Design a protein around this ligand. Sequence first.
Ligand code: NI
Length: 341
Amino acid sequence: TCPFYKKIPGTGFTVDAFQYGVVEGCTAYFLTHFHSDHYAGLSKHFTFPVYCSEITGNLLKNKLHVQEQYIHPLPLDTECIVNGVKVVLLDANHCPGAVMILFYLPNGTVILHTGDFRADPSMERSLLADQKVHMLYLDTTYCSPEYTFPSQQEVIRFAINTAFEAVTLNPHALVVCGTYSIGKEKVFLAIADVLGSKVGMSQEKYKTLQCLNIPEINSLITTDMCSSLVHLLPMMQINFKGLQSHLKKCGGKYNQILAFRPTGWTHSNKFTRIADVIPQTKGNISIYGIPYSEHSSYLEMKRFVQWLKPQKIIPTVNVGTWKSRSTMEKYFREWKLEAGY
Ligand code: NI
């Protein structure tokens, strides 16, 4: 059964609620982004209206084979009417096609559902700035002060410089980047750009990337592995055994692998600066874990909420334990007392 925090009161609407069968009273199913924990349940047999971004709609049609007549893409930053209720989709600064949803209830209440997001000051100048929000359904993934990580720009700087140095020292080194979902495309695209190569990948991954409206993409990606010196592999293969095996398959073209695992947070963040990050090495293989996040750090989240000043917060992540829930509620109260709302 559908949990309360995926339901929008006063509407026929649910958010990211496709794994519960037919939800009683739901007239429209919203999907914030194309990640499996959120789309779980969608397929070509779905016959209710799905509301989403253009990019998410490309992925629904091409990857899950949802029929076109049930896909309802909306433009961002535009007031739209859905079953008699005004809604707006806003960029969530998560993965490609990921949105926040603003709902203007018939009784005058305004609700923001962040979906998954990485809070940014740029959000303080969207259509959020123009009215009060009463209720916030918040992505609380990293809602604790231990969760710090660097900007995406610093992380990409580190990766570009690391890769360019290694390959200039050894033109027979291969760079490998791990992936298991959409998101974090800048890692592998930035590295390929500094090295003057395309990124090589499976046909299934190339198909996924072709749904994303990224400019000039036919110029940056390929299925021809033999012509590429940046390869994408499943995240599960980014270990010494999986990489030794891959290196065999390249037929003596290469004699070294430098690999990258974009994680979210790991506890090496509580001690070490990005400048100071070192790989794990075995023989001719090195693996770097880089803290490239597409969710808010604690400080980013706090700033957003203290700016927005919602009347009520409903967490959507880490809700399954009493200790988590109690922790989060204590931070929410601190933020409110420090800011004065
Ligand atoms: Ni996500």
